[PDB]
Design a protein around this ligand. Structure first.
Ligand SMILES: NC(=O)C1=CN([C@@H]2O[C@H](COP(=O)(O)OP(=O)(O)OC[C@H]3O[C@@H](n4cnc5c(N)ncnc54)[C@H](O)[C@@H]3O)[C@@H](O)[C@H]2O)C=CC1
Ligand SMILES: Cc1cc2nc3c(=O)[nH]c(=O)nc-3n(C[C@H](O)[C@H](O)[C@H](O)COP(=O)(O)O)c2cc1C
Ligand code: SF4
Ligand code: SF4
Ligand code: SF4
Ligand code: FES
Ligand code: FES
Lengths: 240, 437, 127, 178
């Protein structure tokens, strides 16, 4: 198997492994929005960036660890100042136009954006200088809000960060295309002409959306993510 | 004189743009009367595909879309035999500002392009090919379909061409005016019935293109340049330009000049020759020029700059690059801030939205930064921040359009950040003089 | 300058028109979102006239066809905006003194907005 | 819409592989645009049913390009190029004068019923700037105030673009500026 090195660690890993899996299998960490388990990785959020050497032969531009294959004897750097500064910058770009709904957002604590923001954002700039959070002091993007797409799912087009998870899933897993973007640029937004949301497996996007865009109407405004008492069990509605 | 072509030396032979504008040049009869389709006849029955590929490989013919990759080696990357159907893609999406050169090739000399596409299809075993034209070129599209119909009637596109075991056919597909759809991997999405969000480059279209077939995409100027190469020598082609820039190039110029337009000139002519001998010299004092297209970084108006040979190497060593040879003159009467303003707003209009940096920063932040600066609102803070912003976008995007936005701004700062500071520290809007009549 | 004030005032005025249309064609109007600087202002004092920032006209299917927004209280480059979803149509109005509410240089009167919303209803609304 | 024309559908679907029917979304949509002036949802549903795909994908596609209009436009949809070259030739003042005279927004239509406005990026004729396009047709190039107002007075009286007297010279591939 192929030998990879992450910042202090050497890992055996099968050849077809993505660099991201080699980082995490190596025990390091990297932001993650565009990619998902069982979904085709495509470099979209540009969060998964690492440094890659393949001889010390450092790459010119940052490598997308979500769509990078791994080669034997590669050096992966996730702790260099450049990588951390770039990840914080991309978080800044992503939260740029976000609707300021966290306290009243149904996603609350179990929101990947919140966690990766507090994880990687605001690189240590060098004093005890009075810090500034956001540079964006302009008018934010405002689109349609709290729109029920279906008797189970509600849609907030402002919270979408334009990942591909729901449409990637919709084409891949059920094979039922009842969702895709409409326009382009920053005006891009999610919509449908199939209104009943006919596919019998739509609910999973509720869990996948790294933001609170698509939320469960049957569980909207009941309790907070940490507040619910979890009971892991097995469903007996059908024999699977 | 020692054999080297760098300008107006009298041994230059117009090949592509010769018949442009001549009335009835779009008739197949015109093309035939000047020796057309002879090169297809000779190559199809004499040469093998590897031979016509080696021919263009030795021609030094580099990609005419702006890339510069040897189309010979490019075709050498193809499977070159697999049993599957292959496709040849004509990229007729011309969307870079200041670029109007291929338009009239498509309008007035189509059968040159058709012969070149037949040559490339013979080279790469392409039996069917598609021509993707932008939704703003209707005259060229009409003339192209007319030419294809004529060739189909007189037996130039058929089951078996000229007795040999090769086949070829072309099909036109009109676009709807989207700059990103010109991207070679996004064009295939747009045609295929998808939204034009680019594809992964590590799989190249030579190995996976339209509908999974091994397609090859070449620029219109490249396909047209194939025909003379096969016609009269590859060395004759390589007779023009420096050691890394062989052949001729279709330069075009726009701006406050006496007679802007197109000139089929060798690679390496000085900017002074182009603007002054040909375009008649500027009409107003120019503060800078954008050589390649719009995506290229501006360079100052200097004598040591005016002497620069327009090539794939001399501009490389000066910081800018030769995208299309489409020069635009920026005068002192218009602020650089306003020029890059319009550039960034244009690139914001045309982003696909996949990459966070391009979509968000460019369409929301960068354009807003330029607006605040040049509308009499900015402060030095915005210029510092925008200065730091570009390296956060350049390195990491799925398609280089994002880099296409920062490099012109990047250089615009490295030579004219001072200007912005003025408009920052004066809190002055960009000057708005009356320019049109 | 101080034009901002009247703009927000003018913005409130705009909302009235929207609501009126709702009763005219019997079409659903919805308050989309209120000001954050009014929810999250805890003790801080608040002088703005209304609390609503974003609203829309939704068709029978609930999908909006017309959107209107106003700039927040502390943001740079303040404006009022209109958008037709799915139609790639954006309008950006200011308030010029003496003239009134104007889209750039062209006045934005009640009749213009009524016609625009009626065109959206006839064309874009699915049901 | 495409019910009437099945020969055209056969011709378009023969241009693409039997599995690549979806490519046909591009031409079919276009045929609607120039025929009816704007794209209705029914057109999109019909394109999907004919081509064997979901209306959602087709709508996303159609809204991806700037040319495809989904609201009514005037009989003469004046597409104004606003790019660098055309601005340097006065697309700012041209656009300002045009819109202020006609009194329209880019989303709405003149009450006369034949004039709509829209900004467009590079029309690929830069030396002859400024440039304007009328809904599908070869550009009216070298647009000066006289050229614009004459084109307007002609179109107002029902003159076909092919038959309108345009003052001034517009070069083919080069053009003399004086
Ligand atoms: N309208 C216009 O004329 C415009 C022109 N441009 C110019 O065009 C350029 C865009 O060209 P790109 O598509 O980025 O080309 P590129 O430089 O990335 O690659 C050139 C060609 O060779 C192939 N290639 C490169 N490396 C390869 C490898 N190792 N193995 C196999 N194949 C390989 C690529 O697939 C491509 O077809 C811009 O950088 C700019 O200069 C850009 C925008 C608009
Ligand atoms: C974002 C993007 C946009 C592009 N737009 C164009 C274009 O409008 N016209 C063009 O000829 N090439 C364009 N290209 C370059 C393509 O690579 C080009 O079709 C291809 O290089 C043709 O190959 P050739 O130059 O070897 O003949 C674009 C590339 C990118 C990345
Ligand atoms: S999606 Fe996440 S970051 Fe955004 S408002 Fe909801 S909890 Fe906050
Ligand atoms: S709605 Fe959610 S899952 Fe879908 S693209 Fe947006 S962020 Fe991703
Ligand atoms: S740089 Fe990224 S977001 Fe921008 S057009 Fe290219 S792929 Fe789309
Ligand atoms: S994680 Fe690789 S770009 Fe989204
Ligand atoms: S700039 Fe308007 S046509 Fe190229």
């Amino acid at each position: 198997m192929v030998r990879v090195k992450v910042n202090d660690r050497i890992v055996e890993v099968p050849p077809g492994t993505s660099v991201m899996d080699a980082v995490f299998h190596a025990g390091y960490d990297v932001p993650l929005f565009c990619s998902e388990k069982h979904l085709s990785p495509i470099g979209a959020c540009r969060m998964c960036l690492v440094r890659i050497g393949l001889p010390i032969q450092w790459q010119p531009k940052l490598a997308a660890s979500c769509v990078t294959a791994v080669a034997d004897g590669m050096v992966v750097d996730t702790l260099s100042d450049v990588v951390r500064e770039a990840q914080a910058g991309m978080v800044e770009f992503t939260l740029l136009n976000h609707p300021l709904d966290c306290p009243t957002c149904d996603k609350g604590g179990a929101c990947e954006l919140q966690d990766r923001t507090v994880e990687y954002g605001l690189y240590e700039k060098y004093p005890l200088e009075l810090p500034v959070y956001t540079r964006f002091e302009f008018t934010r993007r405002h689109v349609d809000k709290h729109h029920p797409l279906s008797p189970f799912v509600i849609l907030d087009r402002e919270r979408c960060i334009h990942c591909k998870r729901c449409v990637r899933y919709f084409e891949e897993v059920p094979g039922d295309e009842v969702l895709d973007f409409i326009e382009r640029g920053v005006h891009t937004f999610i919509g449908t002409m199939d209104f009943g949301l006919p596919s019998g497996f739509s609910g999973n996007i509720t869990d996948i959306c790294p933001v609170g865009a698509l939320l469960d109407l049957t569980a909207r405004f009941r309790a907070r993510n940490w507040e619910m008492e979890e009971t892991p069990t097995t469903c007996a509605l059908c024999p699977v | 004189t020692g054999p080297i072509l760098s300008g107006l030396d009298p041994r230059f032979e117009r090949t592509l743009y010769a018949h442009v504008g001549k009335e009835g040049s779009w008739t197949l009869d015109y093309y035939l009367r000047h020796g057309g389709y002879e090169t297809a006849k000779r190559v199809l029955k004499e040469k093998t595909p590897d031979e016509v590929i080696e021919e263009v490989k030795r021609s030094g013919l580099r990609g005419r879309g702006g890339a510069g990759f040897p189309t010979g080696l490019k075709w050498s990357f193809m499977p070159k035999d697999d049993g599957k159907q292959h496709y040849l893609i004509c990229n007729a999406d011309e969307s870079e500002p200041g670029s109007f050169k291929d338009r009239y090739i498509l309008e007035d000399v189509p059968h040159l392009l058709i012969e070149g596409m037949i040559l490339a299809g013979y080279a790469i075993r392409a039996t069917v090919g598609y021509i993707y034209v932008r939704g703003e070129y209707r005259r060229a599209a009409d003339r192209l379909e007319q030419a294809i119909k004529e060739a189909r009637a007189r037996g130039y596109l058929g089951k078996n061409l000229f007795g040999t075991d090769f086949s070829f056919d072309l099909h036109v597909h009109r676009g709807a005016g989207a700059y990103i759809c010109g991207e070679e991997t996004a064009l295939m999405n747009s045609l295929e019935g998808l939204r034009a969000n680019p594809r992964l480059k590590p799989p190249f279209p030579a190995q996976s293109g339209l509908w999974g077939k091994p397609t090859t995409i070449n620029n219109v100027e490249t396909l047209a340049s194939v025909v003379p190469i096969m016609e009269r020598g590859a060395d004759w082609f390589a007779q023009m330009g420096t050691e890394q820039s062989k052949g001729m190039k279709l330069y075009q110029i726009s701006g406050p000049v006496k007679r802007p337009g197109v000139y089929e000139l060798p690679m390496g002519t000085t900017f002074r020759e182009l603007i002054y001998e040909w375009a008649g010299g500027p009409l107003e004092p120019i503060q800078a020029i954008i050589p390649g297209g719009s995506s290229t970084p501006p360079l100052p108006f200097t004598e040591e700059v005016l002497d620069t040979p327009m090539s794939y190497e001399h501009l490389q060593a000066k910081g800018s690059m030769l995208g299309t040879g489409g020069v635009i003159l920026i005068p002192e009467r218009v602020s650089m801030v306003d020029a890059m303003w319009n550039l960034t707003r244009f690139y914001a209009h045309e982003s696909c939205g996949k990459c966070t940096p391009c979509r968000e920063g460019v369409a929301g932040f960068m354009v807003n930064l330029f607006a605040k600066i040049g509308t009499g609102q900015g402060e030095e803070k915005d210029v510092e921040n925008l200065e730091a912003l570009l390296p956060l976008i350049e390195g990491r995007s799925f398609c280089p359009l994002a880099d296409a936005a920062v490099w012109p701004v990047k250089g615009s700062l490295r030579h004219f950040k001072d200007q912005y500071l003025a408009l920052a520290r004066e809190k002055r809007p960009v000057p708005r003089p009356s320019l049109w009549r | 300058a101080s034009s901002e004030r009247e703009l927000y005032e003018a913005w409130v005025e705009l909302l009235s028109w929207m609501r009126e249309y709702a009763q005219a064609k019997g079409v659903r109007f919805e308050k989309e979102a209120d000001f954050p600087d009014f929810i999250y202002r805890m003790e801080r004092p608040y002088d703005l006239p209304t609390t609503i920032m974003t609203a829309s006209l939704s068709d029978g299917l609930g999908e909006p066809f017309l959107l209107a927004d106003v700039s927040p209280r502390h943001a740079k480059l303040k404006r009022i905006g209109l958008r037709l979803p799915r139609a790639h149509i954006h309008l950006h109005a200011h308030y010029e003194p003496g003239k009134g509410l104007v889209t750039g240089k062209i006045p934005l009167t009640k009749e213009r907005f009524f016609a625009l919303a009626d065109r959206a209803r006839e064309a874009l609304a699915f049901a | 819409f495409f019910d009437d024309k099945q020969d055209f559908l056969e011709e378009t679907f023969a241009k693409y592989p039997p599995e690549g029917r979806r490519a046909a979304i591009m031409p079919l949509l276009r045929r609607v645009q120039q025929e009816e002036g704007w794209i209705r949802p029914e057109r999109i549903e019909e394109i999907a049913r004919l081509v064997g795909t979901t209306p959602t994908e087709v709508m996303g596609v159609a809204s991806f390009y700037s040319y495809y209009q989904f609201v009514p436009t005037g009989k003469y949809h004046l597409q104004v190029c606003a790019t660098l070259s055309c601005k340097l030739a006065g697309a700012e003042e041209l656009w300002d004068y045009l819109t202020e005279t006609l009194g329209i927004g880019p989303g709405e239509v003149t009450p006369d019923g034949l004039f709509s406005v829209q900004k467009v990026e590079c029309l690929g004729s830069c030396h002859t700037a400024p440039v304007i396009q009328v809904n599908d047709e070869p550009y009216v190039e070298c647009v000066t105030r006289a050229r614009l107002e004459a084109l307007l007075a002609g179109l107002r009286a029902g003159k076909r673009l092919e038959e309108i007297e345009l003052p001034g010279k517009c070069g083919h591939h080069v053009h003399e500026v004086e």
